[PDB]
Design a protein around this ligand. Structure first.
Ligand SMILES: O=P([O-])([O-])OCC(O)CO
Ligand SMILES: [Mn+2]
Length: 424
């Protein structure tokens, strides 16, 4: 078992990258605000429906002219755990499981998570806020193992009928109430806001909608237009509130889609909406779910690096100025010159700058045309993808952090974490 951990640690060493001196430590002990966009795909960016921009605020952020650096080639790497898989990868730089939910199944594994590292190295307190109850996706148990200090679940918000739709709290009230809670917290904090309204089947009361549905005939695609606009408006007002509360200028703020919202079941309607046949290659392209990051003292822009959610943890750690040599991570720092531009997907497909590998076939990213003669680096990349998934799975299945005496990590005692019922 210890030997199994050793094999994984040795494997994760080669990819390690040095921080970019332009970015190294620039956000040390600054508040970090992390905003989850439920089911958000970047095909929405700059998309109009009936002449209206679906997501006008995110469109502005994606210009690069609004203090955020936008990554247009950024992919979720999730499976059956959906939001829970995204959360798992974002805070650990590990993959979820190939079947089922790592949160549900591995919630009492030992972890060396991002929030715990920030707490230990720099005195952060970490929190999650979400307008649903705490034991969904086993979050209550998992967060204690991740070393999250506070969980503002649905008991912290008014869950009356007027404030809820679909799975729980409406995003607009969620963001408003959440900014109010953040204003009352001691710095430095690491705060993760998990949204909810832009979730299958994508239903929104007419009174709350500010855009008409598309007319594809597919209720899922047509409804998605409205819930995406609603989320964009919710986020815009949230950013305004941060400015009013003095929580904008000196915070790291990152924004990310958790995973795709529209499956291949909806290919007929998506062809109508996007004006292009949804081939397997095109569907892979549509798994772009976006990353936006604002860093104090840095201007925004557009960074075309191909990347995945596994890369977020080492990025944040390097921004804080924390040495990552001893952390078992599969991702690499987005701003580092040596960033590894290979993005494994959970099903064994993958993407690189130049090509994608989808259901056993290779396509050029330029035109999604089939590539007939193997790229020089293909076998190397395919081996990396397969081994990354196997090695990550070995950590989870073997609960291998039990055996890691990490000099840069103090073992979490999960029993020291408790999330009290909120006032509402
Ligand atoms: O995992 P999902 O289905 O994307 O999101 C659902 C929730 O976060 C529920 O609280
Ligand atoms: Mn989700």
């Amino acid at each position: 078992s210890e030997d199994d951990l050793t094999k994984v640690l040795n494997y994760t060493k080669q990819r390690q990258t040095e921080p970019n001196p332009e970015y190294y430590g620039v956000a040390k002990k600054k508040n970090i605000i992390k905003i989850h966009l439920e089911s958000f795909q970047t095909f929405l960016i700059n998309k109009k429906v009936n002449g209206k921009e679906v997501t006008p605020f995110l469109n502005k952020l994606s210009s690069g002219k609004e203090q955020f650096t936008y990554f247009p080639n950024f992919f979720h790497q999730t499976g059956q755990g959906k939001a829970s898989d995204s959360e798992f990868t974002m805070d650990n730089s590990l993959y979820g499981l190939p079947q089922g939910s790592a949160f549900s199944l591995k919630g009492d594994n030992t972890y060396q998570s991002l929030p715990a590292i920030l707490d230990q190295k720099q005195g952060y307190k970490s929190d999650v806020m979400h307008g649903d109850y705490k034991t969904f996706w086993n979050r209550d148990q998992v967060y204690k193992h991740f070393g999250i200090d506070k969980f503002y679940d649905a008991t912290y918000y008014d869950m009356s009928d007027k404030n809820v739709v679909n799975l729980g709290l409406k995003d607009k009230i969620f963001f408003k109430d959440s900014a109010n809670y953040q204003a009352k917290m001691k710095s430095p904090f690491y705060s993760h806001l998990i949204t909810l309204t832009n979730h299958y089947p994508f239903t929104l009361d007419e009174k709350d909608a500010t855009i008409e549905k598309s007319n594809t005939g597919d209720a899922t695609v047509d409804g998605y237009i409205q819930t995406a606009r609603y989320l964009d408006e919710a986020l815009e007002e949230y950013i305004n509130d941060l400015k009013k509360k003095g929580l904008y200028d000196n915070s790291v703020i990152m924004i990310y889609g958790d995973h795709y919202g529209i499956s291949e079941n909806h290919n007929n309607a998506m062809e109508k909406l996007l004006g292009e046949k949804i081939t397997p290659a095109k569907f892979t392209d549509l798994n772009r779910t976006g990353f936006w990051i604002k860093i104090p003292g840095k201007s925004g822009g557009i960074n075309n690096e191909y990347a995945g959610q596994v890369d977020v943890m080492p990025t944040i750690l390097h921004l804080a100025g924390i040495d990552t040599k001893n952390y078992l991570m599969f991702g690499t720092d987005l701003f580092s010159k040596g960033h590894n531009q290979v993005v494994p997907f959970r099903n064994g497909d993958f993407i690189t700058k130049d090509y994608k590998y989808v259901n056993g076939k290779i396509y050029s990213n330029k035109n999604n045309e089939l590539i007939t003669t193997q790229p020089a680096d293909f076998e190397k990349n395919k081996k990396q993808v397969e081994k990354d998934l196997e090695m990550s799975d070995n950590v989870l299945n073997g609960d291998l952090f039990r055996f890691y005496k990490n000099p840069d990590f103090k073992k979490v005692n999960p029993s020291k974490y408790k999330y009290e019922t909120g006032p509402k």
